[PDB]
Amino acid sequence: TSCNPSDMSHGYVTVKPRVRLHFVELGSGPAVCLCHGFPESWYSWRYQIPALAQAGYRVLAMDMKGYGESSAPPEIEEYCMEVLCKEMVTFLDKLGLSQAVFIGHDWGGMLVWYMALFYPERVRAVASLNTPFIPANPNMSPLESIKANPVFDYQLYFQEPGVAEAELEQNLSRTFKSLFRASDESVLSMHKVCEAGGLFVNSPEEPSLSRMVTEEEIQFYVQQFKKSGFRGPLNWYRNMERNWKWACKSLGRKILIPALMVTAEKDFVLVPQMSQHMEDWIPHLKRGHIEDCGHWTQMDKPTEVNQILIKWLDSDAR
Amino acid sequence: TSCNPSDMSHGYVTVKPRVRLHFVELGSGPAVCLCHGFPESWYSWRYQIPALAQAGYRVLAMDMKGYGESSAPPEIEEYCMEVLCKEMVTFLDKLGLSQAVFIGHDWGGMLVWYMALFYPERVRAVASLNTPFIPANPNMSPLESIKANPVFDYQLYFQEPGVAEAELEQNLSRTFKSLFRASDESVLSMHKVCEAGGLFVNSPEEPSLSRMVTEEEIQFYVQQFKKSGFRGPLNWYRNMERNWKWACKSLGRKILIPALMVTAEKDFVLVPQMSQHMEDWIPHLKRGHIEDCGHWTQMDKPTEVNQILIKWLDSDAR
Ligand SMILES: CCNC(=O)Nc1cccc2ccccc12
Ligand SMILES: CCNC(=O)Nc1cccc2ccccc12
Numbered sequence: 001t002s003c004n005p006s007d008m009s010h011g012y013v014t015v016k017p018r019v020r021l022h023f024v025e026l027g028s029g030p031a032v033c034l035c036h037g038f039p040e041s042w043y044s045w046r047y048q049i050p051a052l053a054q055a056g057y058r059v060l061a062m063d064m065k066g067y068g069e070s071s072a073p074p075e076i077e078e079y080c081m082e083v084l085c086k087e088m089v090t091f092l093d094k095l096g097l098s099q100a101v102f103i104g105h106d107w108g109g110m111l112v113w114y115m116a117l118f119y120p121e122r123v124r125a126v127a128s129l130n131t132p133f134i135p136a137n138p139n140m141s142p143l144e145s146i147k148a149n150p151v152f153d154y155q156l157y158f159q160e161p162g163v164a165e166a167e168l169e170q171n172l173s174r175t176f177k178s179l180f181r182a183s184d185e186s187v188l189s190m191h192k193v194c195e196a197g198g199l200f201v202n203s204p205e206e207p208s209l210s211r212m213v214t215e216e217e218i219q220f221y222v223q224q225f226k227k228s229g230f231r232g233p234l235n236w237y238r239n240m241e242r243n244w245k246w247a248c249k250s251l252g253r254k255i256l257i258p259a260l261m262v263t264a265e266k267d268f269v270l271v272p273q274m275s276q277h278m279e280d281w282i283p284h285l286k287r288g289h290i291e292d293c294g295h296w297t298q299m300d301k302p303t304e305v306n307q308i309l310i311k312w313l314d315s316d317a318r
Numbered sequence: 319t320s321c322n323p324s325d326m327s328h329g330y331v332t333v334k335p336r337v338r339l340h341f342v343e344l345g346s347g348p349a350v351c352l353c354h355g356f357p358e359s360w361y362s363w364r365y366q367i368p369a370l371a372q373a374g375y376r377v378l379a380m381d382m383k384g385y386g387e388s389s390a391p392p393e394i395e396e397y398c399m400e401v402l403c404k405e406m407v408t409f410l411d412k413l414g415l416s417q418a419v420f421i422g423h424d425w426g427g428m429l430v431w432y433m434a435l436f437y438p439e440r441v442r443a444v445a446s447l448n449t450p451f452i453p454a455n456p457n458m459s460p461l462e463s464i465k466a467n468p469v470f471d472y473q474l475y476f477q478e479p480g481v482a483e484a485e486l487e488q489n490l491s492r493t494f495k496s497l498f499r500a501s502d503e504s505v506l507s508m509h510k511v512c513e514a515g516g517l518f519v520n521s522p523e524e525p526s527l528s529r530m531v532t533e534e535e536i537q538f539y540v541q542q543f544k545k546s547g548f549r550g551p552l553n554w555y556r557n558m559e560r561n562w563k564w565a566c567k568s569l570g571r572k573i574l575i576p577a578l579m580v581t582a583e584k585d586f587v588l589v590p591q592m593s594q595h596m597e598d599w600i601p602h603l604k605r606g607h608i609e610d611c612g613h614w615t616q617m618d619k620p621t622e623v624n625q626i627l628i629k630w631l632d633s634d635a636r
Contacts, residue, residue: 009413011343012328025329026414028376031346053414058346058376095327096345096371 003046005220010069011060015090019078022069024061027053030124030318031097033088034061037106037131039168039179039233041068041224043217044105047302048309055310060100064108066232068224076161079235080242081114089119098122101317103309105129105297106270107236114247116255125317127260127309129297130267132275133282136247142240151269154193158237167198168230172222178203180218181210183266183294190269212299255282258316262288262308267295286312321364323538328387329378333408337396340387342379345371348442348636349415351406352379355424355449357486357497357551359386359542361535362423365620366627373628378418382426384550386542394479397553398560399432406433410440419635421627423447423615424588425554435568438575443635445578445627447615448585450593451600454565460558469587472511476555485516486548490540496521498536499528501584501612508587530617573600576634580606580626585613604630 009025024042026049034045042061053059063070065084077083088111092100101124104112109131116126136142146152158164168175178188178200187202196202209215259282263272272289279285288308293301326342333339342360344367352363360379370377381388383402395401406429410418419442422430427449434444435451464470476482486493496505496518505521527533577600581590590607597603606626611619 006332007412010330012330014324028349028415028417050414059414094325095343096368096377098346 001047001050003043003049005043012069013091013094015087015094018073019065019071019087021065021071021087021091022063024049024059026050026059026061027057029056029058030313031100032057032059032313033100033102034059035102035104035108035111036062036064036067037104037108038236039175039221039225039230040064040106040108041221043220043224044296044298046217046298048298048306051302051306052309052313055313057101057313062108064111066228066235068227072228072232074231076235076238077242079232080239080246081111082242082246084111084236085114085118088115089122092122099124101125101127101313103127103129104131106131106295113255116257116259117250117253120255120257123257125258125260125313126255127262127312129262129305130264130270130295132261132270133255133278134274135251135281136244138248138251142244146240150191151271152190154190154199155237157193157199158234161231161234161238164199164234165230167200168234169225172225173218174200174203174205174207175225176213176218176221177207177209180213180221180296180299181294182212182292182296182300183268185210186294212296256284259285260288260308260312260316261285262290262297262305264293264295264297264300265289265291266293266300267297269295284316286316288312319365319368321361321367323361330387331409331412333405333412336391337383337389337405339383339389339405339409340381342367342377344368344377344379345375347374347376348631349418350375350377350631350635351418351420352377353420353422353426353429354380354382354385355422355426356554357493357539357543357548358382358424358426359539361538361542362614362616364535364616366421366616366624369620369624370627370631373631375631380426382429384546384553386545390546390550392549394553394556395560397550398557398564399429400560400564402429402554403432403436407437407440416440417442419443419445419631421445421447422449424449424613431573432565434573434575434577435565435571438573441575443576443578443631444573445580445630447580447623448582448588448613450579450581450588451573451596452592453568453599454562456566456569460562464558468509469589471513472508472517473555475511475517476552479549479552479556482517482552483548485518486552487543490543491536492518492521492523492525493543494531494536494539495525495527498531498539498614498617499612500530500614500618501586503528504612530614574602577603578606578626578630578634579603580608580615580623582611582613582615582618583607583609584611584618585615587613602634604634606630 066072102112109128420430427446431451
């Protein structure tokens with residue numbers, strides 16, 4: 001079971017005069033906020049939305065700041081974790097929600113950890129797909145940390161505004177077809193990007209459609225990204241100095257609320273090994289692991305994600 | 319406590335191609351659907367929305383078909399009880415709501431009774447402000463019943479398309495200032511409206527502001543009615559025979575779900591005596607009565623409306 005955009009309830013919350021956030025809503029019961037990653041949409045949760053609502057939950061699948069129908073200001077400062085988390089709290093206030101279960105993937109996963117860290121009174125429970133929780137080191141710089149591991153090469157390529165924007169916007173159909181693939185079907189070399197010139201360097205001009213996605217699904221991402229482009233989505237990566245300084249202010253405090261860390265076996269960037277020793281800083285931490293699952297966790301193994309999320313929600317969040 | 323439109327969560331549900339239903343959403347818990355009357359808005363529930371949300375309820379204040387941000391087709395048939403009720407069922411389906419407590423006023427009150435009558439499985443509990451539930455007599459004609467009562471003379475004036483629209487749209491500021499008044503402040507005589515050839519005859523050109531409303535509140539209704547006018551709202555009255563024929567299909571069946579009948583002492587059109595013997599057709603009917611309260615119930619006595627609704631929701635709807 002998937003989602004048809006015309007058959008969904010579309011909600012709009014003005015968090016700031018310049019910032020309006022779009023979301024889809026399905027089901028009744030406890031509020032469950034779904035936060036997608038880069039370069040995604042609310043549509044990335046298409047298989048989770050009817051499954052979680054059927055399970056007995058009020059699903060609020062977000063269109064993150066800079067994505068789809070949500071506002072996309074050009075400023076880099078507008079995409080730091082501090083302002084992004086603040087808006088999500090304002091989103092809960094304007095909807096009359098005291099608490100909500102926050103589930104995130106990729107960049108959304110990073111947001112949900114900081115939402116649980118800085119606002120535990122507004123987050124009932126926290127779940128993250130692929131993205132682990134690493135407390136910021138005050139004696140270590142955020143720039144040299146990305147330079148240390150060769151897999152985060154594309155991150156430095158994403159820093160300069162306009163450089164990644166022109167490549168990703170060049171051909172939207174080619175962009176999502178090359179990105180949304182299973183690990184065995186993938187051709188993207190994340191280890192070396194800056195030297196290669198771009199991300200779709202080894203990718204063909206007309207790539208084949210992956211087994212996880214259809215032509216209709218790919219074209220929805222194409223139409224959504226025509227509204228604002230890639231500037232807003234890429235700006236999430238351009239706040240390494242601001243995010244590090246804000247995270248160092250928490251230092252000592254822990255995420256005491258019920259947590260769930262879901263690792264993807266085939267994610268070569270957000271490797272399952274990165275999630276090690278997370279229970280030292282998170283006492284009520286639960287785990288989930290998906291075999292043959294790449295980076296696009298929701299699209300790759302929807303049945304496995306639905307099973308783990310529902311089981312954890314009914315036992316630890318309810 | 320009231321509602322500010324810019325700070326509200328705006329939801330949109332496309333129930334039919336050409337028909338999109340707008341609503342404001344606040345709070346968590348059981349779904350509470352609020353249905354306004356003629357010539358109103360979701361804003362008529364401005365005092366109820368924060369009160370019910372604070373009480374522990376998920377408030378869904380509707381912009382009824384033909385009002386404000388909701389779709390307004392010009393077809394008369396599009397505003398009969400049958401198609402209006404079916405669209406509200408589809409509204410619950412697309413939002414993933416199996417049940418919702420329906421609270422209505424005026425035409426919204428007539429809609430909620432028919433939602434409880436034909437779709438009791440989707441109506442958790444039913445409440446109505448001023449509007450009683452009278453079963454349709456298959457031997458009695460709809461035009462004969464309205465003509466027999468001198469108070470329903472204005473309904474005959476509302477029949478011919480364009481006639482009542484031209485008067486109500488002539489001066490929107492005058493329209494809402496003349497209509498939204500407490501019974502003692504009323505400048506409109508609902509008797510002999512056809513004889514006078516208009517509703518605003520005894521009413522002055524520049525009417526004074528009522529004690530219930532401010533200038534800011536009046537201007538909101540003006541701006542909302544600039545979008546589609548009065549054709550859609552007036553079409554709710556132009557389906558007498560269609561509503562009678564559909565109601566006759568229920569014949570003999572009782573509303574077995576929990577129900578609330580709230581009467582307004584000073585409503586001279588929907589008089590408290592019209593609600594007599596309602597318990598014969600509704601076995602589990604609870605009552606409410608507001609003294610010194612005119613037709614604009616929510617506006618006139620907000621504190622009393624909130625006290626009665628919350629008390630009943632906590633004991634019968636939950
Ligand atoms: C929080 C940092 N996470 C990311 O940058 N994730 C990714 C973004 C875009 C393409 C990818 C392709 C493979 C793996 C991860 C990818
Ligand atoms: C379902 C039938 N109810 C109505 O027609 N209600 C009314 C509509 C417009 C103005 C009014 C003014 C006073 C009382 C009732 C009024």
